[PDB]
Amino acid sequence: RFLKVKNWETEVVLTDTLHLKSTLETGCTEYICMGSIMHPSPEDVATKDQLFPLAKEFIDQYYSSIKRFGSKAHMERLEEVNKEIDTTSTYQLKDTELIYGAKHAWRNASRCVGRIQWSKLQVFDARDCTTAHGMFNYICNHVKYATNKGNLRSAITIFPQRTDGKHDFRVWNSQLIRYAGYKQPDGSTLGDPANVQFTEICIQQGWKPPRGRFDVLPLLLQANGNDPELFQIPPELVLEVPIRHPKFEWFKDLGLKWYGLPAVSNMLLEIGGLEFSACPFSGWYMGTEIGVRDYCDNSRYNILEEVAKKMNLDMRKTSSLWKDQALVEINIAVLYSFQSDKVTIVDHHSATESFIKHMENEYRCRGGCPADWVWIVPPMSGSITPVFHQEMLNYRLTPSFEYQPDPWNTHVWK
Amino acid sequence: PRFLKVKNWETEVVLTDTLHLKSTLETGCTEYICMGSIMHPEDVATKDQLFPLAKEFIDQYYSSIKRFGSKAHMERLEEVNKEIDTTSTYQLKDTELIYGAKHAWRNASRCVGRIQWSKLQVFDARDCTTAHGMFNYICNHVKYATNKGNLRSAITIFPQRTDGKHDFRVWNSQLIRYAGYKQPDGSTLGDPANVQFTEICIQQGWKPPRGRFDVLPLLLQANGNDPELFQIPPELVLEVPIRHPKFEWFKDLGLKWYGLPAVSNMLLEIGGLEFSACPFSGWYMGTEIGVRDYCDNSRYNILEEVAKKMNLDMRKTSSLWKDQALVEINIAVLYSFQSDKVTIVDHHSATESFIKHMENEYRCRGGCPADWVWIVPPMSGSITPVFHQEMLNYRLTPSFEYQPDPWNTHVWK
Ligand code: HEM
Ligand code: HEM
Ligand SMILES: COc1cc(N)nc(CCc2cc(CCN(C)C)cc(F)c2F)c1
Ligand SMILES: COc1cc(N)nc(CCc2cc(CCN(C)C)cc(F)c2F)c1
Ligand SMILES: C[C@H](O)[C@H](O)[C@H]1CNc2nc(N)[nH]c(=O)c2N1
Numbered sequence: 001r002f003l004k005v006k007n008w009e010t011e012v013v014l015t016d017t018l019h020l021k022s023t024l025e026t027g028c029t030e031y032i033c034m035g036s037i038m039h040p041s042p043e044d045v046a047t048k049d050q051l052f053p054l055a056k057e058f059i060d061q062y063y064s065s066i067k068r069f070g071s072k073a074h075m076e077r078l079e080e081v082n083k084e085i086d087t088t089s090t091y092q093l094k095d096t097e098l099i100y101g102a103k104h105a106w107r108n109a110s111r112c113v114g115r116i117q118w119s120k121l122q123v124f125d126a127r128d129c130t131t132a133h134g135m136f137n138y139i140c141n142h143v144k145y146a147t148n149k150g151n152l153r154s155a156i157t158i159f160p161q162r163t164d165g166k167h168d169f170r171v172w173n174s175q176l177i178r179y180a181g182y183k184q185p186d187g188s189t190l191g192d193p194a195n196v197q198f199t200e201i202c203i204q205q206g207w208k209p210p211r212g213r214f215d216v217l218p219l220l221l222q223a224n225g226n227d228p229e230l231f232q233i234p235p236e237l238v239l240e241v242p243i244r245h246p247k248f249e250w251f252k253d254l255g256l257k258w259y260g261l262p263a264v265s266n267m268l269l270e271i272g273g274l275e276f277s278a279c280p281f282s283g284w285y286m287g288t289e290i291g292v293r294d295y296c297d298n299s300r301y302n303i304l305e306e307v308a309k310k311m312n313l314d315m316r317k318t319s320s321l322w323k324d325q326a327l328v329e330i331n332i333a334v335l336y337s338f339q340s341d342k343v344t345i346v347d348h349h350s351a352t353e354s355f356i357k358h359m360e361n362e363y364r365c366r367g368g369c370p371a372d373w374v375w376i377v378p379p380m381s382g383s384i385t386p387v388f389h390q391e392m393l394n395y396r397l398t399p400s401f402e403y404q405p406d407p408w409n410t411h412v413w414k
Numbered sequence: 415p416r417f418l419k420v421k422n423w424e425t426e427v428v429l430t431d432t433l434h435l436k437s438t439l440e441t442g443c444t445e446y447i448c449m450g451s452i453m454h455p456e457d458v459a460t461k462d463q464l465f466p467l468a469k470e471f472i473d474q475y476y477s478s479i480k481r482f483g484s485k486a487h488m489e490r491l492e493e494v495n496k497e498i499d500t501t502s503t504y505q506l507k508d509t510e511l512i513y514g515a516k517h518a519w520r521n522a523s524r525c526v527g528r529i530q531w532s533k534l535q536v537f538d539a540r541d542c543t544t545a546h547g548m549f550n551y552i553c554n555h556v557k558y559a560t561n562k563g564n565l566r567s568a569i570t571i572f573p574q575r576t577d578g579k580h581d582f583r584v585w586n587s588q589l590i591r592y593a594g595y596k597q598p599d600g601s602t603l604g605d606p607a608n609v610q611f612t613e614i615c616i617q618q619g620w621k622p623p624r625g626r627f628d629v630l631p632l633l634l635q636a637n638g639n640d641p642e643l644f645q646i647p648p649e650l651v652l653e654v655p656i657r658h659p660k661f662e663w664f665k666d667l668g669l670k671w672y673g674l675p676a677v678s679n680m681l682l683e684i685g686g687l688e689f690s691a692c693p694f695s696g697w698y699m700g701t702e703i704g705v706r707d708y709c710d711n712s713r714y715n716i717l718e719e720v721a722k723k724m725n726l727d728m729r730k731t732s733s734l735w736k737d738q739a740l741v742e743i744n745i746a747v748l749y750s751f752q753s754d755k756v757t758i759v760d761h762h763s764a765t766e767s768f769i770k771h772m773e774n775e776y777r778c779r780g781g782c783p784a785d786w787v788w789i790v791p792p793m794s795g796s797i798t799p800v801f802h803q804e805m806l807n808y809r810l811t812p813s814f815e816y817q818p819d820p821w822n823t824h825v826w827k
């Protein structure tokens with residue numbers, strides 16, 4: 001009813017009433033908490049009986065947000081939706097409703113630390129698309145608009161909603177821009193180990209790999225349930241940063257670069273019981289996503305030993321903390337490099353500070369802010385960011401972004 | 415569903431949990447809201463509430479010694495059943511006290527160091543009756559546990575709660591802490607987290623040396639009477655000066671810390687009995703000192719001072735000057751303890767050990783409850799193996815619980 005959270009660093013207490021509007025399973029029970037489990041646990045289509053309540057609840061909340069609850073427009077819209085569901089088994093969102101739904105799914109993303117920007121989101125309605133070529137064109141316009149010569153802008157492109165489950169639109173790429181990974185016969189991995197499987201799918205589909213360390217993968221686009229199709233993103237639209245270090249002249253000899261635009265394309269946008277299986281959305285990077293996870297995860301580029309080596313660090317025992325020392329210098333390089341090239345990025349201190357400020361405002365104006373602590377806290381120097389000491393309540397608000405099966409596991413080929 | 419799986423996203427190892435079917439008290443979560451990051455979710459049990467609690471634990475004990483449904487098991491069930499009728503409560507056999515203590519540590523979802531759980535030295539202090547007696551026990555605990563720097567894990571168990579008005583309580587949160595003194599100009603000398611406890615000790619008669627690292631006196635409460643002050647003999651209190659293996663100016667910071675981390679404010683539940691005074695100790699993980707004690711803004715807060723001596727650009731947060739000074743502080747804490755042959759473990763070794771332990775626990779027990787929010791070190795998170803480890807969290811008994819501060823709940827004499 002009235003739930004409390006405390007910041008153990010500042011002793012500030014906040015009061016959550018928004019949790020009364022939560023919905024689909026945390027996955028937790030009174031006996032087992034699953035707050036550190038990554039995912040939960042085809043035919044999947046909603047019926048008329050399932051869709052009426054979900055649509056109504058979304059429409060109700062839309063009109064309340066525009067200060068028109070109970071208005072004639074509100075009542076007529078419900079009637080229009082209710083009739084459309086009854087005669088067609090689904091309904092279409094108005095443009096205003098789609099923009100509202102997209103922004104609130106981001107606002108509701110428990111795991112996103114960037115949510116302070118949630119209302120400044122550019123929504124591209126691609127519901128008139130019918131083909132993978134159509135999708136490719138939409139996506140290139142997304143990438144170019146968002147990139148903006150390095151002054152990045154948040155954006156989402158929404159492809160037609162799922163109908164009977166058999167004509168989905170999907171982006172098979174997990175992110176719009178990622179580098180290929182080639183597993184070698186000798187066991188090693190050239191490129192990005194995380195993408196070996198998807199790279200092989202692309203090669204099989206006919207992609208000709210240049211077999212390099214930083215090869216931008218082609219897009220694999222699926223329209224209306226058909227076989228997916230390959231397209232090369234135009235290289236001039238793919239902004240990259242060469243990674244160097246302000247103090248270590250040799251850091252650039254590491255030959256490192258990253259792409260400037262993070263763009264999640266494998267998730268599902270649920271608005272009023274409708275499912276948008278293809279909705280690629282993009283923002284800008286927090287430094288540690290590249291500097292900690294992309295470069296230093298043992299199952300990724302894995303450069304700590306090579307960086308430490310160059311730093312002449314004693315790597316005999318772990319208690320020398322040579323990993324900790326090198327990780328910091330890498331993340332200094334990555335911020336310095338993006339900043340030097342006027343490409344938008346945010347370090348993990350600034351980003352966590354703004355999220356606390358965002359969180360407190362949400363409690364004030366909105367009565368709560370779901371947050372997944374496991375994901376909000378950065379993967380280095382955790383306890384010296386303000387969110388480490390912040391208690392957080394986690395629950396699912398709709399509209400929301402959701403995970404969905406990898407399309408290669410589900411598709412029925414022809 | 416009678417099985418739950420967990421996956422490690424770095425090594426792709428999957429483990430199957432079945433031990434969760436024996437979970438008990440609340441987690442605080444529901445199917446609608448998860449509290450995995452909330453720190454805390456006469457009044458004692460009636461007669462109906464105690465018998466089954468004691469019942470499960472005895473079964474658990476005898477099932478653990480290959481003797482379930484066997485010889486002594488039967489009439490011990492009857493004997494415990496007998497005693498609760500007369501005494502309202504009951505008493506554990508020595509073997510049972512040892513068993514539940516090691517199992518509360520084993521069951522401690524938030525403890526990364528549980529690979530050692532069966533190597534606990536248990537001090538039965540249930541003949542104690544006075545704070546003087548408590549102090550004697552605690553001194554012997556401290557001296558045993560310190561062991562000239564080769565630290566050994568130990569617990570001292572004092573008399574169990576009976577009615578609630580006669581609790582035994584160690585009022586200090588840990589057995590060894592430094593004091594905290596408010597200053598006329600709003601600032602704070604020493605450890606800020608201890609200002610309130612320090613002021614109680616002064617109000618109780620403690621003469622404060624009013625420096626930073628003044629060890630606090632023990633404030634011991636026996637049988638529910640007023641607590642009393644005792645000064646731990648300093649030759650029992652092992653302290654380590656902090657120097658840097660590179661930076662000569664580090665020792666000029668005047669930094670030191672104690673060797674023995676001993677939690678003294680928790681409650682031990684065994685068979686529905688409530689051991690309100692049960693100080694237990696292990697040995698330090700280095701990040702506890704270098705990251706939390708030294709660099710929390712609400713604690714010793716030395717980041718700004720260390721970065722100055724390292725001459726780091728302190729204007730913008732994107733230089734990561736904080737992250738840099740933090741690494742250095744933690745190199746020195748470990749290096750200092752190691753040089754003084756005082757036991758300490760860095761966050762890399764500790765978390766690798768806990769992954770071994772988790773592997774063992776699923777292998778031999780079918781589950782190892784774990785709190786990701788607490789297991790993950792407070793620095794260099796993702797480069798340790800437990801970042802990428804899915805963990806299920808659930809409450810197994812015997813267990814250590816929190817309890818309120820006694821100065822909020824004590825009707826004085
Ligand atoms: C604009 C600046 C943004 C920042 C700084 C930001 C930051 C982050 C970070 C650091 C994560 C965790 C990343 C990871 O470990 O994979 C994350 C996750 C997420 N973000 Fe944001 N993000 C931004 C934009 C967006 C936008 C525009 C959307 C949606 C419209 C969004 C929705 C999400 C979602 C759903 C997740 C969870 C993904 C998952 O569970 O895999 N974010 N964000
Ligand atoms: C032997 C070496 C040990 C190591 C390296 C170790 C390590 C740790 C660490 C780092 C924490 C996190 C505490 C914090 O950050 O505030 C913790 C928590 C805890 N440990 Fe251990 N520990 C050890 C021994 C023990 C022993 C002997 C016991 C009990 C018999 C124990 C029971 C607990 C409990 C109950 C917690 C949770 C405390 C709370 O919830 O506030 N540990 N341990
Ligand atoms: C949409 O806005 C965003 C802003 C920022 N900063 N980060 C993201 C995550 C984007 C992202 C995440 C991941 C990791 C996926 N795991 C499941 C392994 C890899 C990427 F290559 C990528 F790009 C999104
Ligand atoms: C029993 O064995 C152990 C081994 C290790 N390494 N750590 C502990 C907890 C050590 C410990 C924890 C805290 C808690 C501080 N915040 C909650 C405010 C304060 C201490 F003064 C202290 F010492 C116990
Ligand atoms: C908000 C959060 O619950 C709280 O800050 C926790 C996070 N994880 C922790 N982990 C450890 N080991 N010790 C702590 O005090 C905390 N604090």
Ligand SMILES: C[C@H](O)[C@H](O)[C@H]1CNc2nc(N)[nH]c(=O)c2N1
Pocket residue numbers: 036037038374375376377423801802803804805
């Ligand atoms: C097991 C655990 O859930 C997993 O390693 C999580 C931990 N926290 C994370 N936090 C973020 N931001 N991103 C991640 O990929 C993960 N991985």
Ligand SMILES: [Zn+2]
Pocket residue numbers: 028032033034035443447448449450
């Ligand atoms: Zn939970």
